[PDB]
Design a protein around this nucleic acid. Structure first.
Ligand SMILES: [Mg+2]
Ligand SMILES: [Mg+2]
Ligand SMILES: [Mg+2]
Ligand SMILES: [Mg+2]
Ligand SMILES: [Mg+2]
Ligand SMILES: [Mg+2]
Ligand SMILES: [Mg+2]
Ligand SMILES: [Mg+2]
Ligand SMILES: [Mg+2]
Ligand SMILES: [Mg+2]
Ligand SMILES: [Mg+2]
Ligand SMILES: [Mg+2]
Ligand SMILES: [Mg+2]
Ligand SMILES: [Mg+2]
Ligand SMILES: [Mg+2]
Ligand SMILES: [Mg+2]
Ligand SMILES: [Mg+2]
Ligand SMILES: [Mg+2]
Ligand SMILES: [Mg+2]
Ligand SMILES: [Mg+2]
Ligand SMILES: [Mg+2]
Ligand SMILES: [Mg+2]
Ligand SMILES: [Mg+2]
Ligand SMILES: [Mg+2]
Ligand SMILES: [Mg+2]
Ligand SMILES: [Mg+2]
Ligand SMILES: [Mg+2]
Ligand SMILES: [Mg+2]
Ligand SMILES: [Mg+2]
Ligand SMILES: [Mg+2]
Ligand SMILES: [Mg+2]
Ligand SMILES: [Mg+2]
Ligand SMILES: [Mg+2]
Ligand SMILES: [Mg+2]
Ligand SMILES: [Mg+2]
Ligand SMILES: [Mg+2]
Ligand SMILES: [Mg+2]
Ligand SMILES: [Mg+2]
Ligand SMILES: [Mg+2]
Ligand SMILES: [Mg+2]
Ligand SMILES: [Mg+2]
Ligand SMILES: [Mg+2]
Ligand SMILES: [Mg+2]
Ligand SMILES: [Mg+2]
Ligand SMILES: [Mg+2]
Ligand SMILES: [Mg+2]
Ligand SMILES: [Mg+2]
Lengths: 201, 261, 150
RNA sequence: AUAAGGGAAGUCGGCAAAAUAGAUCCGUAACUUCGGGAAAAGGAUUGGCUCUAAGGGUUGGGCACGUUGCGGCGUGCGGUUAACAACCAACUUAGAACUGGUACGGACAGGGGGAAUCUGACUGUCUAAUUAAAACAUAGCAUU
RNA sequence: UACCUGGUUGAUUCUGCCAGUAGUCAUAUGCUUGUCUCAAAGAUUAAGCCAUGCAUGUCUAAGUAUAAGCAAUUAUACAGCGAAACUGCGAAUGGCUCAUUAAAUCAGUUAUCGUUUAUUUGAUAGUUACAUGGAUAACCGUGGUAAUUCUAGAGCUAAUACAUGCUGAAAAUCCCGACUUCGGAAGGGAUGUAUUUAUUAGAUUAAAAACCAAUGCCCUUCGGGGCUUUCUGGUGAUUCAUAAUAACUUCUCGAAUCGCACGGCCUUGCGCCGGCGAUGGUUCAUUCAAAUUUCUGCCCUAUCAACUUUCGACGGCUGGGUAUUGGCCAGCCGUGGUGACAACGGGUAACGGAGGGUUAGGGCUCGACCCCGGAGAAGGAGCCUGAGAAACGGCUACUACA
RNA sequence: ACUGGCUGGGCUGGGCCUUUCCUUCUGGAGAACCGCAUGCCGGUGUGUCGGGGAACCAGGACUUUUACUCUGAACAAAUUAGAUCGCUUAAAGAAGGCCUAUGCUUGAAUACAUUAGCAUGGAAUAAUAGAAUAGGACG
C-alpha cells in the first residue's frame, strides 16, 4: 500500500536511485480521515504492537479551557471560521489541529455568575425579557464573592463583546484523527488581536 | 530479518566458554534473563563442561528437573539460564557453594566458598530516581530493584545484598583509594587500587588503577567494579589477579613441578 | 541576523506551553515561569549569546530557545553558501593516504547545517557545528559558534 | 443530401466526394546554405453553476513664531509612519467543489499527413475567347 | 633460494619480443592404480522445467471429559489411565540460492533528550459475591456432487472461548453552604489508575539594613523587649523524573480461574481463620532485539562534460499520516542543490566482508561456497492474522507455463 | 652463580643558579621542618597542642589552530605467526598428567592488523594566527 520511505526519492546530487527491495510491513501509511462537524461517529484501528488509535469522522463537542480563570467545561462547536494552511478546510467545516472555531458560551458564563457576584455581558436590559432575581441564601457569600471580584479583576472589553452574542473563539489543540477528541482553549490577549484583524479584512 | 533469532552457531559462541570446535555444529544459545548474552555463564556449560557431573545434554536436564541446583537461593529449572558476575550457585546434596568470578585470564573459574559467605552478594548500582507515587528506588547490575534506599547512595557505587531478604546492608563510595576488579576489556580479571580518575564531557570517562606489584593500567568507567576499600569483602581466587608475564609463568610452572616432583 | 517582523505569517508564532495572558502579575527571575522568554544552556562549554536571550525572534529549531538537543559529533568547517533561509553550506577539507605510493591526496566533502537568527554569518567564515536529530532531508547539524575574522 | 458489411477490387489516373480544422498545455526526426525544416509526425483538455486568489488610481501626515476670514501662504525646523486609513474603478489570468442520458470551438467559422524520383533556385510575368508550364524575366558570372 | 637459459648475424656488442622453467584449497581430460589417517562434491552454461515420497507440530499433580473407551471395584457431583474435539502457544527460527544491486549493500566507529518490543528476570495497583447470562464443537441421526484436507440442514452439553458485574477503611486535599453574635461552622459533592487538553511547583551554592501596608505569637513591671524558623532528586545539556488543580472518554485495568497438603480457635455454627505452587494482570526497570542514524573508505570507462525541478528537484511555515524523526505526503511562500578534488550516463562474464593463491622488500590476482550482514522463492502488485510477515512447505488478481 | 668496592668510564632520567622554572582559586586529608611538658638508655610515641601546609585527591577559571610521532583505551570467533602436551610418528587435535587410590592437579598463553574515530607525552621538521589610520597590553 502507501509507503513513506525515502527510497523512491531522488538523491541530493540529482542522481536517480535503483530498485532495492519490495515494500516493507513497516514504513506504511494510512488513508487520512477528514473530521466533520456532526453527530458523533468514531472507528477503531489496530496499530503497531497491538495498541489502538481512534479515527474521528464526525464530532460536535469537546473540552475547552479558559486560561485566566482556570475552568474547563465541555461545550459544542458551532462552525469553523479560519485555517492558516488551506481555505478548503474552512469551507467544508472540517476540523483539524490549529483550527479556529466558534463555541457556545453558555457553560462559561454560568460559572462566572456563581463564582463572582456580578453579571457578565448583558445588554438585554433594553429588552429586559429574561430579567430574574433569586434570593441569596446567605450574607457571607457577598463577603466571599466581593473579595474575589475586587482581587482578581475584570474581563477586558474584547472578550466581553463576544459574550453578548453567546459565541466564543477557540483553537483546536488536539489531533482528532489520532485521539478522536477535539480539545482546545479560549484564545485571548494579543493572540486575539492577531486573528480578529486577519479574520475580517 | 522477519523476527528474533533462536539458534546459536558453534564457532560463533563467546570465546571464554572454551568450547571445542568439533563434536557438533551448534551452541547452547543462552536464554534471555538478567545478564547479557555476550558475557554470561549458561548453567549447562557450568554443570557439564566444568564440573563434569553430567556426561551429555540429555542428563544435564535430568539433574535440573529434580530441583537440586539453585542460584541466589532460588531454584532454576531451565538448563540455559544466564548466570553472571557475583552470582552464588549452591548445590545442597553435594554440599558446596560456588561464586562466579573472573580469573586473571578473563574467564570464569570454579571457586569454592564457605557456607557463611554464601549468604550475601554485592552489585554495582545502575540508576537512582523516583518511581510511581514518589517512592525512591535503585536498580543494580543484575536487574534487582529495591525501594526506599539510603539517600547517601549515588550511582556507580556498590551495595551489599542480604540475598535472603534483599535489603541493602552497608555500601562503598566510588572514589580514589578504593579496591576494584575489572569486568570487561583486555585488562579483564585484574585487581587494583584506583589511583585517580579523569572525566571527559560527552561520555567515556577513564580511570587509572595500580596493581599490587606497582603495575599500572587504565580502563573505561563501565568496566570497573568496586569490591572494597581495603581487605576486599569477597574472597578472591588463587593468584589474586596479579597478571604475571609469560616469562614468569614458565618459570613458576617448572619450579612448582620440580618442587612437587 | 536581520528580520523585518516577527509575526509575518498565516498563523501566530509563539513558544509552546508559555502562558502569556495572566490576570495577576508576578515578577520572577526564572525564564519561562513568569511568562517571559524561555531559553536553556546547551553545555560542553558553549555560552548562550546575548542576542538569544533578549531577542524577539521565534524559532523551533534553534539550539537556544528551541526544542532541539545537541548530542553526537562536533565538527568544524568553512561556509561556502548562505543563499537559503536559515540554512548554510560548509566545506570540509582533509587528506587521504594512498598506501602503495606512500603519499597523500586532497579530498573534500560538503555539509548542510541550520543557522539560528542569533548569529550573523557571512561567506568565508569558520564555524563550529553540532549534531542533532534530522530536521530536513539533508540537515542534521546545527551552528554553535562563529569564529572571529582575521 | 444520407446510407448495412467491405474499403480503390472502379478508372488512362483516387477525377468527384469524404476525412482533418479554433484556443490552452505537453511532444517533435532525417537533412541543412545554421536562417530553416515545423502548424513536422503524435497526444490531452473545452458547458452550466456557487466560490477563492493575484495584477491598479486619487487624497490625507509634527512642533515654534508672523500674516490673514475653523484656515491659505511667510517661514524656523524636525521626522521617513518596522506603511497605516478612508474613498474610487474597468477588464485579464490561474485554482477548487457540486451538477448532466460523457455532453460542451454543440449553429456558423475552420490545415489531411508521411517515404522518394524528374525538373526550374526563390517572389514576379505571358498566348483577352481551347495550352499558366520544365517556357520568359531575375540577382550572380563572362566576353566585345 | 634476492637465480635465469635456447632463437635475428659470415662473425660481434645491444634494444626487443617469442619459447623454455616452478607453484595453485584451480576446473576439465588421457593412461595406470595394493594399505593406513582425513572427506570436498549440479556454483560457472539454464534464478531453466519438474512425476513420486518426506521435510512442523505440541499434555503436566495444575484450562474443558457422562467416549453405548479401557481398567479396577473406597468414593451417588466429579476422582485411575485416557481417543476425539474446543481453548492456549509455535509455525516470522532453521535449511537453500546469488537473479537484481556502483555511496546502494557492506566494514570499523557514533546516536536514539527521535521509537515499538511477545517471552525471561526484579519490584509494584483498597473502588446474587457462599459465585451472574446466552451460544457452539466432538457425539447421535438424515443428505447432496464424476471429483478435493468440500460441506448442508436437524437434535444435546462445557470454559482460563465470548459477554456482564459487587466502597469491605479512614484520614487528608478542593469546591458548594443549612444556619449568626460577623470573628467560623451544621452537612453536601468530588477525590485510585489508563486516555485527551489547559494551568502550577520542580529552589541556591558570598552579606548588613532602613521604610509602607498588618498579623501566629512568646516573654512581660502593661511603660512593652521582640519575632530565631520546615522540605526540594538527577544529566555535559531539556518543557527530565515525580507531584498538585479544573475537566474530559461509544474507554481501559484493579482475579466469578486451577492443583497439592488436613491444620488451628469456641459463642459447635453443614460457622470463622490459615500454608506452599500453577495460570493471569496495570506501570517502571532489565534481557533477546528490531527500525532509523553520524564520520571515513569501493573495479574499468571522456568515442559520457555539464546535471537535477512534466507530476519535489534544495530550503522556510501550518497541518495530515506513521511505532517515532524526516519534502514521507497535502496546501501557501522563497530560488536553490551537485561538478575537473571527475558530478551525471554507460560496462561488469559484480552480492559485500572475514579471508584464499603466489612472495627478498614493495606488490599482483581471486573471493557463488561451512562464520557475520543483505536480498529472493517462476515474473509483478495487494492483503489477512499476530508481539513480530508486505510471509509464499499463508491467501486474492492479472501475465507465462501446467 | 653469590657479595662488596672502584673518586671506574659510558648510557637513560630527574632536580637547582645563570634576565628563563612552570597558570590560578576553593576544599579535602596530612607530612617535613619547629618549639610546649609529660617518660627511657641526644634522639623518640607524646596531642583532637599550634607557627605549618612537600606531595596527593576532588572542584572552578584561564591555554593560537592543524599535520606528524610515542604510550594507552575500545575492537570476532575460524585463518596467518607463535607457547605447552609423544594422538605409536605425521597432516591434525585441545588435550592431559601423578602413587594404586573409593582422590589430588593443570592447561586451553602471547603478538599482528591500521585507514578513519576517542584520550595521553613530546615540541624538531612543514604550514597557520597576533599591535601600523593603534579599534593594542597592564592597574
Ligand atoms: Mg551520553
Ligand atoms: Mg457504405
Ligand atoms: Mg458503416
Ligand atoms: Mg480501414
Ligand atoms: Mg486497378
Ligand atoms: Mg492525367
Ligand atoms: Mg479533388
Ligand atoms: Mg469537407
Ligand atoms: Mg526554430
Ligand atoms: Mg514549432
Ligand atoms: Mg497538430
Ligand atoms: Mg517534411
Ligand atoms: Mg470544467
Ligand atoms: Mg478540437
Ligand atoms: Mg468537431
Ligand atoms: Mg519557377
Ligand atoms: Mg487562352
Ligand atoms: Mg487556362
Ligand atoms: Mg623480483
Ligand atoms: Mg637484423
Ligand atoms: Mg645461422
Ligand atoms: Mg611463457
Ligand atoms: Mg590390515
Ligand atoms: Mg544453477
Ligand atoms: Mg490426570
Ligand atoms: Mg512460551
Ligand atoms: Mg504464532
Ligand atoms: Mg533464515
Ligand atoms: Mg546446495
Ligand atoms: Mg513479571
Ligand atoms: Mg479470555
Ligand atoms: Mg514532563
Ligand atoms: Mg512538521
Ligand atoms: Mg556553484
Ligand atoms: Mg568483487
Ligand atoms: Mg550477478
Ligand atoms: Mg562471498
Ligand atoms: Mg553466477
Ligand atoms: Mg567447492
Ligand atoms: Mg525454478
Ligand atoms: Mg503471537
Ligand atoms: Mg522474504
Ligand atoms: Mg510473495
Ligand atoms: Mg517448496
Ligand atoms: Mg519459508
Ligand atoms: Mg600441530
Ligand atoms: Mg598528540
Amino acid at each position: 500500500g502507501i509507503s513513506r520511505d525515502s527510497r523512491h526519492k531522488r538523491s541530493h546530487t540529482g542522481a536517480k536511485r535503483a530498485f532495492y527491495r519490495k515494500k516493507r510491513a513497516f514504513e506504511l501509511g494510512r488513508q487520512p480521515a477528514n473530521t466533520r462537524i456532526g453527530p458523533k461517529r468514531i472507528h477503531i484501528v489496530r496499530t503497531r504492537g497491538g495498541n489502538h488509535k481512534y479515527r474521528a469522522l464526525r464530532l460536535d463537542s469537546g473540552n475547552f479551557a479558559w486560561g485566566s480563570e482556570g475552568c474547563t467545561r465541555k461545550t459544542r462547536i458551532i462552525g469553523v471560521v479560519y485555517h492558516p494552511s488551506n481555505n478548503e478546510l474552512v469551507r467544508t467545516n472540517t476540523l483539524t489541529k490549529s483550527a479556529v472555531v466558534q463555541i457556545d458560551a453558555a457553560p462559561f458564563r454560568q460559572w462566572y455568575e456563581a463564582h463572582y457576584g456580578q453579571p457578565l455581558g448583558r445588554r438585554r436590559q433594553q429588552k429586559q425579557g429574561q430579567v430574574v432575581e433569586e434570593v441569596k441564601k446567605s450574607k457571607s457569600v457577598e463577603k466571599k464573592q466581593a473579595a474575589r471580584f475586587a482581587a482578581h479583576g475584570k474581563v477586558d472589553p474584547a472578550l466581553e463583546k463576544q459574550f453578548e452574542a453567546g459565541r466564543l473563539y477557540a483553537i483546536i489543540s488536539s489531533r482528532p484523527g489520532q485521539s478522536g477528541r477535539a480539545d482546545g482553549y479560549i484564545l485571548e490577549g494579543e493572540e486575539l488581536a492577531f486573528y480578529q484583524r486577519k479574520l475580517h479584512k | 530479518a522477519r523476527g528474533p533469532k533462536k539458534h546459536q552457531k558453534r564457532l560463533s559462541a563467546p570465546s571464554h566458554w572454551l568450547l571445542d570446535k568439533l563434536s557438533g555444529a551448534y551452541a547452547p544459545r543462552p536464554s534471555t534473563g538478567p545478564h547479557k548474552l555476550r558475557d554470561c555463564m549458561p548453567l549447562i556449560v557450568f554443570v557439564r563442561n566444568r564440573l563434569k557431573y553430567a556426561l551429555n545434554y540429555r542428563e544435564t536436564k535430568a539433574i535440573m528437573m529434580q530441583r537440586l541446583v539453585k542460584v541466589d537461593g532460588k531454584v532454576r529449572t531451565d538448563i540455559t539460564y544466564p548466570a553472571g558476575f557475583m552470582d552464588v550457585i549452591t548445590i545442597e546434596k553435594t554440599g558446596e557453594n560456588f561464586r562466579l568470578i573472573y580469573d586473571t585470564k578473563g574467564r570464569f573459574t570454579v571457586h569454592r566458598i564457605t557456607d557463611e559467605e554464601a549468604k550475601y552478594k554485592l552489585g554495582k548500582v545502575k540508576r537512582v530516581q523516583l518511581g510511581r507515587g514518589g517512592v525512591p528506588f535503585l536498580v543494580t547490575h543484575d536487574a534487582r530493584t529495591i525501594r526506599y534506599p539510603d539517600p547517601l547512595i549515588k550511582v556507580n557505587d556498590t551495595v551489599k545484598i542480604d540475598l535472603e531478604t534483599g535489603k541493602i546492608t552497608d555500601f562503598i563510595k566510588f572514589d580514589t583509594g578504593a579496591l576494584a576488579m575489572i569486568t570487561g576489556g583486555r585488562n579483564m580479571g585484574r585487581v587494583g587500587v584506583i589511583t585517580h580518575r579523569e572525566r571527559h564531557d560527552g561520555g567515556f570517562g577513564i580511570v587509572h588503577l595500580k596493581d599490587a606489584l606497582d603495575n599500572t593500567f587504565a580502563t573505561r568507567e563501565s568496566n570497573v567494579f568496586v569490591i572494597g576499600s581495603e581487605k576486599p569483602w569477597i574472597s578472591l581466587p588463587k593468584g589474586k589477579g596479579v597478571k604475571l608475564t609469560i616469562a614468569e609463568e614458565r618459570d613458576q610452572r617448572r619450579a612448582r613441578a620440580l618442587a612437587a616432583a | 541576523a536581520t528580520e523585518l517582523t516577527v509575526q509575518s505569517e498565516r498563523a501566530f508564532l509563539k513558544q509552546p506551553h508559555i502562558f502569556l495572558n495572566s490576570k495577576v502579575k508576578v515578577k520572577s527571575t526564572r525564564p519561562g515561569k513568569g511568562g517571559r522568554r524561555w531559553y536553556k544552556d546547551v553545555g560542553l562549554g558553549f555560552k548562550t549569546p546575548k542576542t538569544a536571550i533578549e531577542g524577539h525572534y521565534i524559532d523551533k529549531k534553534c539550539p537556544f530557545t528551541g526544542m532541539v538537543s545537541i548530542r553526537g559529533r562536533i565538527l568544524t568547517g568553512r561556509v561556502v553558501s548562505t543563499k537559503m533561509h536559515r540554512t548554510i553550506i560548509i566545506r570540509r577539507e582533509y587528506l587521504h593516504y594512498i598506501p602503495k605510493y606512500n603519499r597523500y591526496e586532497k579530498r573534500h566533502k560538503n555539509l548542510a547545517a541550520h543557522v539560528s537568527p542569533a548569529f550573523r554569518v557571512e561567506e568565508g567564515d569558520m564555524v563550529v557545528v553540532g549534531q542533532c536529530r534530522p530536521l530536513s532531508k539533508t540537515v542534521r547539524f546545527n551552528v554553535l559558534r562563529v569564529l572571529p575574522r582575521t
